[PDB]
Amino acid sequence: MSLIDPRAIIDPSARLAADVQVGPWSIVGAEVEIGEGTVIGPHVVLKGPTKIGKHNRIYQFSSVGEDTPDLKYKGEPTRLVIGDHNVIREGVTIHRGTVQDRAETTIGDHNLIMAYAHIGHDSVIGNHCILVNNTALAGHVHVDDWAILSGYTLVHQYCRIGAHSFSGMGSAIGKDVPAYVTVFGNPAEARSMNFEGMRRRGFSSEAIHALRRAYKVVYRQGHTVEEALAELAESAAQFPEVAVFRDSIQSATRGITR
Amino acid sequence: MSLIDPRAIIDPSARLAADVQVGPWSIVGAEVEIGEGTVIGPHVVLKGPTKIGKHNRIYQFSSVGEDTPDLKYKGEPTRLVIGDHNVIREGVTIHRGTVQDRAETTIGDHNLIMAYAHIGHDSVIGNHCILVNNTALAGHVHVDDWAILSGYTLVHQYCRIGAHSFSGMGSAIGKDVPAYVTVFGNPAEARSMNFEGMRRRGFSSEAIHALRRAYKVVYRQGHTVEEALAELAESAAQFPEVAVFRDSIQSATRGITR
Amino acid sequence: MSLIDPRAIIDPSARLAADVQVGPWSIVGAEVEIGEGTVIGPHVVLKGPTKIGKHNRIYQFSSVGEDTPDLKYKGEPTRLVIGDHNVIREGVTIHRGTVQDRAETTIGDHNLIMAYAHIGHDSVIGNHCILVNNTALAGHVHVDDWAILSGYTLVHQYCRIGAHSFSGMGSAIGKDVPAYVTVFGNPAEARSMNFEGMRRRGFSSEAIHALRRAYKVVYRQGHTVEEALAELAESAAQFPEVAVFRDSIQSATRGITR
Ligand SMILES: N#Cc1ccc(CN(Cc2nnc(N)o2)C(=O)CSc2ccccc2Cl)cc1
Ligand SMILES: N#Cc1ccc(CN(Cc2nnc(N)o2)C(=O)CSc2ccccc2Cl)cc1
Numbered sequence: 097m098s099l100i101d102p103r104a105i106i107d108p109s110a111r112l113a114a115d116v117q118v119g120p121w122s123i124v125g126a127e128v129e130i131g132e133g134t135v136i137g138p139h140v141v142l143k144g145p146t147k148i149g150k151h152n153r154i155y156q157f158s159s160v161g162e163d164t165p166d167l168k169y170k171g172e173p174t175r176l177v178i179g180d181h182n183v184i185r186e187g188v189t190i191h192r193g194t195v196q197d198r199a200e201t202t203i204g205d206h207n208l209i210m211a212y213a214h215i216g217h218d219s220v221i222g223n224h225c226i227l228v229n230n231t232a233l234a235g236h237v238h239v240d241d242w243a244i245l246s247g248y249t250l251v252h253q254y255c256r257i258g259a260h261s262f263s264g265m266g267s268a269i270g271k272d273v274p275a276y277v278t279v280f281g282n283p284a285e286a287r288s289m290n291f292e293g294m295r296r297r298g299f300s301s302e303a304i305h306a307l308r309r310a311y312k313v314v315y316r317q318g319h320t321v322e323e324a325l326a327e328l329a330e331s332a333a334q335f336p337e338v339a340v341f342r343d344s345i346q347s348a349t350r351g352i353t354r
Numbered sequence: 355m356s357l358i359d360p361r362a363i364i365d366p367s368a369r370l371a372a373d374v375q376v377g378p379w380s381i382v383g384a385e386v387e388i389g390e391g392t393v394i395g396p397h398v399v400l401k402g403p404t405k406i407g408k409h410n411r412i413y414q415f416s417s418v419g420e421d422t423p424d425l426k427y428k429g430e431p432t433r434l435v436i437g438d439h440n441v442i443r444e445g446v447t448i449h450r451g452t453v454q455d456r457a458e459t460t461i462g463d464h465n466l467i468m469a470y471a472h473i474g475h476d477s478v479i480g481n482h483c484i485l486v487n488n489t490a491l492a493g494h495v496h497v498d499d500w501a502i503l504s505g506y507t508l509v510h511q512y513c514r515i516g517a518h519s520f521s522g523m524g525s526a527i528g529k530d531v532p533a534y535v536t537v538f539g540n541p542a543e544a545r546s547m548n549f550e551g552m553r554r555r556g557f558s559s560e561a562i563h564a565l566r567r568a569y570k571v572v573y574r575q576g577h578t579v580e581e582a583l584a585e586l587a588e589s590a591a592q593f594p595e596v597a598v599f600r601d602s603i604q605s606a607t608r609g610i611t612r
Numbered sequence: 613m614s615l616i617d618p619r620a621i622i623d624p625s626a627r628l629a630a631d632v633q634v635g636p637w638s639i640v641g642a643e644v645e646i647g648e649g650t651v652i653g654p655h656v657v658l659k660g661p662t663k664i665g666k667h668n669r670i671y672q673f674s675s676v677g678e679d680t681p682d683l684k685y686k687g688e689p690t691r692l693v694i695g696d697h698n699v700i701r702e703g704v705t706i707h708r709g710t711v712q713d714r715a716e717t718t719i720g721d722h723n724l725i726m727a728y729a730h731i732g733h734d735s736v737i738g739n740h741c742i743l744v745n746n747t748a749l750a751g752h753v754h755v756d757d758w759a760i761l762s763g764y765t766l767v768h769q770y771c772r773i774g775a776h777s778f779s780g781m782g783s784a785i786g787k788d789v790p791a792y793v794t795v796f797g798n799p800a801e802a803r804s805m806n807f808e809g810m811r812r813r814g815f816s817s818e819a820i821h822a823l824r825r826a827y828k829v830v831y832r833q834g835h836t837v838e839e840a841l842a843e844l845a846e847s848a849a850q851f852p853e854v855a856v857f858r859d860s861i862q863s864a865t866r867g868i869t870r
């Protein structure tokens with residue numbers, strides 16, 4: 097009983113580790129590297145230059161490491177890097193980067209990418225993200241740790257989904273989602289904060305509330321961004337959690353001279 | 355060529371009726387049971403424990419019987435039950451139950467589940483339902499007979515879709531959708547009642563109108579749900595058709611004392 | 613590398629040009645015609661009667677020429693036509709026509725149909741159209757040249773998407789989209805005009821401006837469509853670019869006598 101199946105295809109150009117298993121009718125293309133204990137299901141298409149890590153699980157009908165259909169991509173040998181302990185569910189589409197950004201699509205550790213979800217070119221996902229069904233990242237989308245993207249959440253190109261943030265099902269995100277913020281609908285509008293996630297991450301009640309006031313300052317208090325950021329400065333100095341929230345709003349805003 | 359294509363792999367644990375046709379590069383997993391005249395297309399992945407009824411047609415790229423990715427589910431042996439005369443089109447993802455509900459996903463008889471649709475854990479489906487393209491049922495979703503869910507309809511967990519009720523395309527469903535009621539958009543708002551469904555099911559000239567008056571009480575009259583069920587009480591007792599509508603509202607509401 | 617892979621199933625009635633590539637585990641059904649230098653990836657189902665033209669690229673997990681699940685279609689011998697120099701990405705579903713319309717679904721040359729998109733019965737696609745991830749054309753939909761349909765755009769049956777027009781991501785199109793208009797939302801509403809589309813297609817600044825003034829008449833001025841098309845007449849006879857726009861509006865509105 098062999099790890100790699102007789103009906104599967106493995107390129108001698110590819111590099112598979114020890115307990116790497118490849119299900120039947122699965123293509124392991126050239127320049128693909130699969131780390132220790134990773135399991136590849138049946139009818140799975142893997143294309144390189146790709147670097148899949150240790151103990152990931154890639155389900156049937158997923159197309160991982162494919163050239164973007166983007167008219168931007170001219171054929172360049174761009175990469176994709178996948179961490180350890182990721183779950184890439186059925187029919188998930190992961191495309192490699194474009195020379196235009198930094199030639200790389202990057203997925204971290206312990207992420208759960210559910211059915212038909214799209215991780216488009218030059219996107220960067222951290223650790224412990226949950227990407228529910230058909231969640232689509234257009235390209236160059238940066239998804240920080242613990243972000244939850246509810247079913248069919250769509251993200252416009254270049255956006256930044258903050259740490260601990262949450263997007264409601266069928267969300268259309270066109271601007272950066274600050275850390276801990278819960279956005280909902282098409283077009284995504286901020287509703288509140290991921291207090292449940294804060295609890296899960298063992299956040300002190302003092303820090304949870306600091307984050308509740310931190311939201312009210314940015315949104316509810318009628319302040320502008322440039323003002324909210326300035327107000328936040330005190331609470332942000334007192335709470336490393338409020339400081340994550342402020343830095344996410346500071347990195348989203350640049351602006352022009354008047 | 356014999357019904358079970360030689361390019362297909364069947365678990366010696368599986369039990370298939372003698373006239374069951376299985377296409378090439380398909381997988382019939384352990385504990386999968388398939389009733390008389392059921393046709394399984396090419397590239398279909400069936401995982402057990404699953405009971406598939408009679409005269410069903412399963413199209414290519416479907417992953418029927420697969421474990422839910424939900425962290426709630428820990429690999430507990432739970433079931434999938436599919437009725438008779440169903441159409442599960444291309445790439446339909448049907449997942450098995452979780453021990454938290456009653457460990458079973460249930461699909462009735464004579465239903466049409468279209469391309470890339472999703473029936474998540476414990477979702478219970480009645481009969482003659484049309485579940486249009488990419489429709490997603492998050493988990494523990496109940497769908498009563500005749501119901502029509504337009505393309506890319508998203509239903510939340512624990513939700514109840516009533517009998518003959520229609521949901522417009524792109525619909526994002528949060529609360530219950532009572533029987534006959536047409537709901538549209540993200541978030542789904544009630545608009546009218548499925549009068550074509552009533553016409554198709556030969557509803558008496560009197561019932562159709564009794565149901566139109568019934569929606570008004572609930573919606574258009576500015577009553578509470580408590581007062582709506584009170585006004586409906588008379589008509590529900592006059593017609594078993596309105597009673598089907600009164601019960602969908604009755605079961606959907608409980609609330610707290612005050 | 614060989615041209616047609618040993619594990620592919622090529623029906624004896626399918627007619628392929630001498631240099632067609634059919635990947636492993638791909639099915640080329642009866643009455644499927646394949647043009648000079650077309651490429652069919654691994655895991656692709658092609659059903660006839662379908663005519664695929666020259667230098668096309670059909671990708672994995674695609675179902676091209678499958679009968680529509682629609683209840684109006686009763687196993688008729690209806691057709692599907694695909695042009696030349698087209699790209700049909702992973703998981704795309706294209707269905708044949710119904711005898712009801714012209715018994716034919718057609719896709720012209722130079723299109724980009726992105727991952728998991730759907731082309732329903734009797735749909736007619738022009739040339740140089742981009743159809744981003746999971747676009748869904750319910751049926752009888754007409755997409756004209758250079759139309760850009762963003763991620764997860766949903767298009768109701770019998771609709772017309774005009775030349776150079778654009779729908780934003782997660783748009784639910786119910787009424788016709790005139791040529792050049794940028795429509796957004798569920799339900800989709802007209803926002804402006806695809807000016808970037810106009811520059812790319814080398815439009816004269818004199819005619820870009822004429823088209824700006826054109827949208828203004830219809831949408832931004834309080835004119836009834838009757839009055840809109842009347843005011844447009846002058847500009848349309850001066851600018852062929854504006855003429856297209858007048859016609860796209862002309863062809864949508866028929867109306868009933870009053
Ligand atoms: N592990 C987990 C986990 C946690 C939070 C979410 C966010 N969430 C709520 C939810 N919680 N458990 C479940 N199954 O869903 C949704 O996205 C609902 S929409 C949806 C959901 C599932 C499938 C298709 C659709 Cl369309 C989703 C999954
Ligand atoms: N048999 C049937 C039947 C009945 C009602 C519906 C509900 N419906 C309208 C409609 N009626 N006939 C058709 N083809 O569509 C939609 O869902 C449109 S959206 C859509 C539709 C199809 C595919 C992808 C998408 Cl996105 C759909 C099918």
Ligand SMILES: N#Cc1ccc(CN(Cc2nnc(N)o2)C(=O)CSc2ccccc2Cl)cc1
Binds near residue numbers: 232233251253742780
């Ligand atoms: N060739 C091209 C081309 C041109 C315009 C568009 C329109 N467009 C903006 C954009 N431009 N390049 C990219 N990748 O996106 C979107 O539709 C964003 S949404 C999205 C995007 C990609 C995948 C899934 C989703 Cl959901 C898209 C592609």
